[PDB]
Amino acid sequence: MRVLGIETSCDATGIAIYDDEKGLLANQLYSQVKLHADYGGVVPELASRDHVRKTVPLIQAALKESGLTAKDIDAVAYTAGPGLVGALLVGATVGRSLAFAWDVPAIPVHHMEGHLLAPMLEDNPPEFPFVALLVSGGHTQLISVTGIGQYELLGESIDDAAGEAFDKTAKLLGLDYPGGPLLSKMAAQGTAGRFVFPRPMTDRPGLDFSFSGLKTFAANTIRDNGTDDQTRADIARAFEDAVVDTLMIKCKRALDQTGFKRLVMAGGVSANRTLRAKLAEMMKKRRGEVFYARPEFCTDNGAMIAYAGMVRFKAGATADLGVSVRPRWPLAELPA
Amino acid sequence: MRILAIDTATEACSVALWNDGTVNAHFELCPREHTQRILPMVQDILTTSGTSLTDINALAYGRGPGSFTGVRIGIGIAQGLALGAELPMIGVSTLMTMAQGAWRKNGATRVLAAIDARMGEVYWAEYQRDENGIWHGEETEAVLKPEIVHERMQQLSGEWVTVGTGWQAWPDLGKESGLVLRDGEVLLPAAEDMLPIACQMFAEGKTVAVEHAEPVYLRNNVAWKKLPG
Ligand SMILES: Nc1ncnc2c1ncn2[C@@H]1O[C@H](COP(=O)(O)OP(=O)(O)OP(=O)(O)O)[C@@H](O)[C@H]1O
Ligand SMILES: [Fe+3]
């Protein structure tokens, strides 16, 4: 089969076509990054407006790219949440009505299930069961995954998620929003150990996370130290290493608790080159395996929605004529 | 020709069908329900009309202004249908729609349309029907504070009819304007009143491909303050 997948949950418009035989037939993406960069965050109304300008043309360009016509599409999938109500509504109305007009089933997709499954799009997808690390802008969870929709929350952040933590310390360092990818690059020219940040919630057992203490620890360090590019880079690396090591330690503990030998890494922060190497090294020493998506599928993208749409269609999750979005949509609520 | 019209720019949901002059129309109030009602209603009106989506020659949609969220529901649902069924699209102003409704209901030909835009402001338009049934005044559409509407009405003369939630929120909008103001008995736009406008636009070749359909928000200063620098 073939599933058209539509992603507009936040600040990026994504359209893909997934073929369960041939693979990925189309991938289209428009990022609104420079729309919101002057505001220091995503302005909801400006996001909602640009999705209206991009959704349809990107859909046209995906069918055009793929050389496919409407009859070649067996289902239409769209992100129903979580995300900005305003953004999610663009993708879901176009999607629901496009499926109505094509007379094919419509498939509402959970955005985080999307990230979680994106690694299934590479060579050698992980088999169930696995531990999953979901590290994004607003979410940082450890999950025990035994199958589709069998997602048990092992751990989560009680305050800032890792991504926002990267974005907030990146801003203190004077970088564009979102600065997480830019702090990481800045940190590449940092001296290891020059500064030493805490690894939060690693002195007691447990699998929950806390990162808000790192912003303060970074801010305080930038304030008592030089402004030369090198010292800035030294703080950036101190911050990265701290986050990466915190996530690593937590992943270890979750693999220990569950007994699983497979670690799935997901969300925007999973693009982080330092965290990829580190997780990959740890699973070697454990005689197990790490899985993550190509960097482009870590951040928001339509391809993961065309895939998870495919998966949920096979699992019976079609929608009636109603359209509904869920800006807050707990992963725990997805049925099996 | 056949025309399908849908609208969700305000608290109402409506769909209407025109079949070479014979009209099928449905209207109801949908506060907080638009996405749960809109596609079921398109389906109702197709089936009860014995017409399929592929029979339709043009899709008309309420283009704005109104609720940003409602305006996008309308355009998004319409784009999907048109994309999906390969239909050309016709964007109809919600202010002009309510003016047509006034014309329909009591023969009004001079309409002051005001929508509650919230934030102390109203979406404003002065529409006037010519002998041939065409509405003039599309250039007058704006989002305005009550005091600037007052200044606008001072440049106007005569008798006008009033339509839209605007006057419902500001009943003394035209106080000391110098005009004779009559209630136009139209609170909200109805897809049925899109049809005749849609028809004339269709005749003169004013239909666009799905990718050209655009909302009209009027209020464009929607963002918080830029960062220092
Ligand atoms: N190379 C990188 N290093 C660190 N962080 C990164 C990197 N690349 C992306 N990110 C982070 O990824 C986030 C965006 O990814 P994603 O879309 O998963 O999160 P989100 O949409 O904010 O989260 P949620 O889905 O919980 O709302 C940003 O916080 C960004 O800083
Ligand atoms: Fe995301």
In this structure, are A133 and A218 located in the same domain?
A: yes
Q: Strands A75-81 and A140-147: what pairing?
A: unpaired
Please name which of A13, A9, A50 lies closest in space to residue A29, comparing C-alpha atoms: A13
d(CA A95, CA B86): 15
Cα B197 to the center of its chain, rounded Å: 11
Phi, then psi, of A283 in degrees rounded to 5: -65, -25
- Count of CB contacts below 8 A, A vs B? 104
Six token digits for residue A96: 């629901």
Resolution value, angstrom units:
2.3
| Whether residue A137 is found in the same domain as residue A260 | yes
Burial tier of A35 (Cβ tally within 10 Å: 0-12, 13-18, 19+): middle
**CA-based nearest residue in chain B for residue A100:** B81
What's the angle, vertex CA B155, arms to CA B149 and CA B156, rounded to 5? 90
CA torsion angle for B223, A179, A328, A323 (degrees, to 10)? 60
Q: Are residues A148 and A258 in the same domain?
A: yes
Does ligand 1 have an atom closer than 6 angstroms to the CB of A137?
yes
Looking at the DSSP assignment, which residues form a beta bridge with residue B110?
B128
Ligand nearest to the CA of A114: 2
Which residue of A90, A98, A175, A176 is the best one to mutate when testing the B interface, meaning the one whose CB has the most B CBs within 10 A?
A98
In order of their start, the domains of chain B are: 1-93+189-229 (3.30.420.40), 94-188 (3.30.420.40)
Sheet arrangement for strand A106-110: A23-31, A12-19, A2-7, A75-81, A106-110
Beta partners for residue A265, in sequence order = A133
DSSP codes of every residue in A64-98: HHHT--GGG--EEEEEEESS-HHHHHHHHHHHHHH
CB count, 10 Å around CB of A28?
24
d(CA B72, CA B225): 24
- Asked if B25 has any chain A CB less than 8 Å from its own CB, the reply is no
| DSSP single-letter state for residue A137 | S
Cα-Cα-Cα-Cα dihedral of A57, A62, A67, A71, to 10°?
A: -90
* Bridging pattern class, strands A262-266 and A130-135: parallel
Q: How was this structure determined?
A: X-ray
Mutate which of A100, A175, A176 to disrupt the B interface (most B C-beta within 10 Å)?
A: A100
Contacts of B47 (CB under 8 A, 6+ apart): none
At A140, the amino acid letter reads: T
Pick the closest to residue A122 from A295, A312, A240 (CA basis): A295
Shortest distance between the Cα of A60 and any Cα of chain B, in A, equals 9
CA distance A78 to A94: 9
User: Inter-chain contact A52–B224, Cβ cutoff 8 Å?
Assistant: no
Round the CA-based radius of gyration of chain A to a whole number and report it: 20
Co-location of A133 and A63 in the same domain: no
Bind-site residues of A: 111, 115, 134-138, 167, 180, 272, 300
Do A276 and A149 sit in the same domain of this protein?
Answer: yes
User: ω before B40 within 30° of 0 (cis)?
Assistant: no
- As for how many domains chain A has, the answer is 2
Angle at B40 between CA B34 and CA B41, to 5 degrees: 75
A149 and A110 share one domain? no
Chain centroid offset of residue B25 CA: 15
**Which residue lies with its CA nearest to atom 23 of ligand 1?**
A137
CATH label of the domain that carries residue A236 = 3.30.420.40
Interface membership of A31 toward B (CB under 8 Å): no
Please state the atom number of ligand 1 nearest to the C-alpha of residue A167.
31
Minimal Cα–Cα distance from A179 to chain B, Å?
15
Strand pairing partners for A18? Answer: A3, A24
Instruction: Please name the residue that has the structure tokens 């919630």.
Output: A201
Give the closest residue to A238 by CA, choosing from A279, A281, A184, A275.
A184
Q: What's the gap in Å between A289 CA and the centre of ligand 2?
A: 24
Could you tell me if A324 and A210 lie in one domain?
Answer: no
Question: Domain range for residue A26?
Answer: 1-128+294-336
Give the tokens for residue B49. 């009309």
CA distance A186 to A230: 9
Check if A310 has its Cβ closer than 6 Å to any atom of ligand 1.
no
Residue A49, chain B, CB below 8 Å: the answer is: yes
Output the CA angle A61-A91-B201, nearest 5 degrees: 75
B79 in reach of chain A (CB within 8 A) = yes
Rounded CA gap, A251 and A133, in Å?
A: 7
Rounded to whole angstroms, how far apart are CA atoms B113 and B160?
10
Of A39, A97, A325, the CB nearest to B81: A97
Residues A141 and A153 sit within 8 Å (Cβ to Cβ): yes
Write out residues 141-180 of B within 8 Å (CB-CB) of A: none
Tokens of B89: 């699209």
**Number of residues in chain A:** 336
Is residue A131 within 8 Å of A251, Cβ to Cβ? yes
Q: Are residues A143 and A257 in the same domain?
A: yes
Same domain, A28 and A122: yes
Cβ A336 vs Cβ A149: under 8 Å: yes
Sequence-distant (6+) residues with CB within 8 A of A108 are: A77, A78, A79, A80, A92, A317, A319, A324
| Residue A268 neighbours by CB under 8 Å, 6+ apart | A135, A136, A137, A163, A180, A298, A299, A300
Report yes or no: B99 and B113 within 8 Å, Cβ to Cβ.
yes
Option in B42, B43, B83 nearest A56 (CB): B83
CA distances from A253 to A147, A165, A208 (A): 21, 22, 11
Instruction: State whether B39 and A102 contact (CB < 8 Å).
Output: no
Q: E strands of chain B, at which residues?
A: 2-7, 12-19, 22-29, 58-64, 89-93, 110-118, 121-129, 135-136, 142-144, 159-163, 180-183
A44 and A96 share a domain?
Answer: yes
B129 bridge partner residues = B135
Q: Are residues A160 and A192 in the same domain?
A: yes
* CB-CB under 8 Å, B68 with A101: no
Indicate whether A134 and A225 sit together in one domain.
yes
